[PDB]
Amino acid sequence: GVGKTSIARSIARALNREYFRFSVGGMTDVAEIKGHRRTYVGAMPGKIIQCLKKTKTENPLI
Amino acid sequence: WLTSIPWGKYSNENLDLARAQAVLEEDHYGMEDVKKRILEFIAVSQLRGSTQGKILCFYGPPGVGKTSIARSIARALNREYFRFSVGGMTDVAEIKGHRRTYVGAMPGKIIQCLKKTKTENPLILIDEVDKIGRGYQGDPSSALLELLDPEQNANFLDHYLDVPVDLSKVLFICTANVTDTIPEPL
Amino acid sequence: LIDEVDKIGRGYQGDPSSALLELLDPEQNANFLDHYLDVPVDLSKVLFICTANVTDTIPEPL
Amino acid sequence: RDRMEMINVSGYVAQEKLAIAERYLVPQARALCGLDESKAKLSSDVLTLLIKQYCRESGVRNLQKQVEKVLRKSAYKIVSGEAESVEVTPENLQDFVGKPVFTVERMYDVTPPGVVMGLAWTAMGGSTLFVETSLRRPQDKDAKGDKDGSLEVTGQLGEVMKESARIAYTFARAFLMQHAPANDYLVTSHIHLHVPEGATPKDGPSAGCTIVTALLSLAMGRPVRQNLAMTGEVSLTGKILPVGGIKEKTIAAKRAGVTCIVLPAENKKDFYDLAAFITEGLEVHFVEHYREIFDIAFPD
Amino acid sequence: GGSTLFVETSLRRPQDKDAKGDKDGSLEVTGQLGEVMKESARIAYTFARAFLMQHAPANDYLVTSHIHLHVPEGATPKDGPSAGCTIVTALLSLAMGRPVRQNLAMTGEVSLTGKILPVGGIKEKTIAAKRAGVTCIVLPAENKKDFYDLAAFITEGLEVHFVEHYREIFDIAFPD
Ligand SMILES: Nc1ncnc2c1ncn2[C@@H]1O[C@H](COP(=O)(O)OP(=O)(O)O)[C@@H](O)[C@H]1O
Ligand SMILES: Nc1ncnc2c1ncn2[C@@H]1O[C@H](COP(=O)(O)OP(=O)(O)O)[C@@H](O)[C@H]1O
């Protein structure tokens, strides 16, 4: 609660680039960042892929 | 599924303080703090103009009527009612649905609640949140935070229906006899 | 009639206790449905009996 | 860790939080609730009292929730109550938010013998832990037996903390031998002490100075000087080594009301690196060796 | 919700195995104690010996005596430390053999020195206490406001006792 996220968003706006936050805290399954192998039923890509798809840009703020 | 979703359709919320207070008083005894808080929400919403929805929890022992008071609030407010059990759950799909690809894949239960209520301002109850197990394949706590986040929830989507939905008016209600096992971010 | 309620396994990809609870829920039972059949059914008038040599091992939500 | 440069976000002074809220938060919440300054009014004193009693942390979120709740209550009182416009005073704050939440919170305002205040750079800001020492067995174990005064410790001790406690114990024994050889209290006595949690393991050794101070105070029974704080690390010789998170510890000390404090001379610039308004109302004491602290803690 | 639990202390070894014996009265504990509970009980016994020595040096009962203690389980871990005052009181009563004042209950955390920290869940604790038919209740001074937050129709018959240090607790429990 000291605005680290707030300052990150402010920097995103100042640079004109998009803002996104990733919650790596308490995360161990690297698959979440590396997705799946695409074979498992309903496999998903790494969360970076989802972030890029959402932002629609290749130079957002991470 | 998509068409059945109530798009921009909201129940006519009851905005009269006196009748709501009388209804709550004749529905349950005590809970003066809860009555004060809900009526304060009513007053701000009336002042706020457009209807809105925030999230809160009724934490206390069982047999207290938390579900009963939730029903009383839902009926008094004129908004629809729905409840959800999450205790010991391990499949995030029930929140985020399936991929829609497998034949008969169902969407998240929130989509089903929207379909049933026919409004974008219903009342949703989540119970025994503290009892979640978040075991293998689960970790719905992340999904719970996504669904609850006041800013992100406006663009919440399920795996089945990839398109997002706004949840700035829904009223989520959580219940748990203890405030410790529940995750800190939540 | 449900026989040997106390003997449930509740294992990987099992957990019928949830199915039991939803089936017997006094309000959800009125609109119960399954995977093969996607239609709710009322059960308020159906009568349920259960058997178990012990009660302690019976899951509390049940 | 080494792949980036780590920048610290210390926190906010009570005045700093006051200014931020009255410039950033209060307007934001008022806009969110749709209120106006005319109808919705807040004074500096009410928010200061809120900060001092209703809330206490390095963070600000709790203040955000408090202000939101009081603003919503005022919106209720206007929509429903008889007050077209709300004026907020510490008198009305009791009805608006309720009774004071946090008192001074300082466990001891007198610091009896064997318990000493100490600043710790916890993960969520700073903390003022009251390191406490105690005699687990009467010193008269035997009028002739000189059995070693085996020590006890609690507080989920990690290995490095255990070594810090042991080295501090040995150094305190040596210091007492040199200063007061006639005293065997720390020599022949089964002592226990506790270390409250919160301090990050890297910052945990900073409590060695507090440990030695508490041990000496218990040994000779004179309570440490009131409203006095200390923290540091010893290298078995009384030499005082530098530490990190000094600004957060100073912020906590200020919040704690302690007016006298001792820092390593190495971190002296860092303390001087802080804003003047931060260091108001406190008299620092830069040291390098433990001996000085003794007189500082025990001028008499 | 709330509950009332009878913390019990029993002597599991003769007090005087050997008068000249100087071995400590090693403690034993039950109640499915998490570690933090173990340090809490450790602190409680430390302060118990300290208070006894301060107030009854002639008594070596608590010193050279191996005693066991059971605290009934069920309490949430966050509230488990709140039994420190109760543990100290039970140990003292066993030491001097003076039964505690009847219909008298307490709950709190001790800082190893007798100074009491506040505890949460006061309201349900008081509800159970009344349902336990207990008249005099001892609480921290700090929690006092929370007690006053309660409505009058609950508090009837409660001879509350608000403290910050154990000496007051000792005197209230041991009017003599
Ligand atoms: N200097 C500041 N000015 C305005 N708001 C602040 C400031 N510092 C903290 N905040 C508040 O903190 C919140 C965001 O903090 P955040 O970035 O989450 O910090 P952290 O990452 O440490 O939790 C915002 O709601 C904001 O109002
Ligand atoms: N003050 C009250 N007024 C009316 N009914 C109550 C009250 N307190 C408890 N109840 C009853 O107790 C029942 C318990 O409901 P339940 O779903 O178990 O809520 P909770 O999970 O809070 O115990 C409810 O049906 C309700 O009618």
Author numbering:
A (entry chain E): 526 to 587
B (entry chain C): 464 to 649
C (entry chain D): 588 to 649
D (entry chain E): 650 to 949
E (entry chain C): 774 to 949
What does the paper say about this structure?
One of them, ATP-dependent protease Lon, is a member of the AAA+ family (ATPase associated with various cellular activities) and is responsible for selective degradation of unfolded, oxidatively damaged, and short-lived regulatory proteins, which prevents their toxic aggregation. Following its mitochondrial localization, Lon’s NTD specifically recognizes and binds protein substrates, which are then unfolded and translocated into the enzyme’s proteolytic chamber formed of the ATPase and protease domains, where they are degraded into small peptides. In this study, we investigated the effects that phosphorylating two Lon tyrosine residues, Tyr186 (found in leukemia cells) and Tyr394 - the only two found in its NTD - might have on the structure and function of hLon and the effect of polyphosphate on hLon’s stability and activities.
Other hLon mutants were produced by exchanging Tyr186 and Tyr394 for glutamates (Y186E; Y394E), thereby mimicking the negative charge introduced by phosphorylation (hereafter “phosphorylation-mimicking” hLon variants), or for phenylalanines (Y186F; Y394F), which acted as non-phosphorylatable controls (these mutations were introduced to verify that the effects of phosphorylation were not due to the loss of functionality occasioned by the removal of the Tyr hydroxyl group). When either, Tyr186 or Tyr394, were mutated to phenylalanines (Y186F; Y394F), the caseinolytic ability of the resulting proteins substantially increased, with almost all β-casein digested within the first 5 min. Altogether, this suggests that the Y186F mutation is largely neutral, while the Y394F mutation has some downstream effect on the ATPase and peptidase activities, which is largely corrected by the binding of a substrate. All of the substitutions that introduced a negative charge, Y186E, pCMF186, Y394E, and pCMF394, decreased the melting temperature of hLon by at least 2 °C while the Y186F and Y394F mutations had the same thermal stability as hLon WT. Cryo-EM maps were obtained for Y186E, Y186F, pCMF186, Y394E, and Y394F with resolutions ranging from 2.9 to 8.5 Å (based on the 0.143 cut-off of the Fourier shell correlation curve).
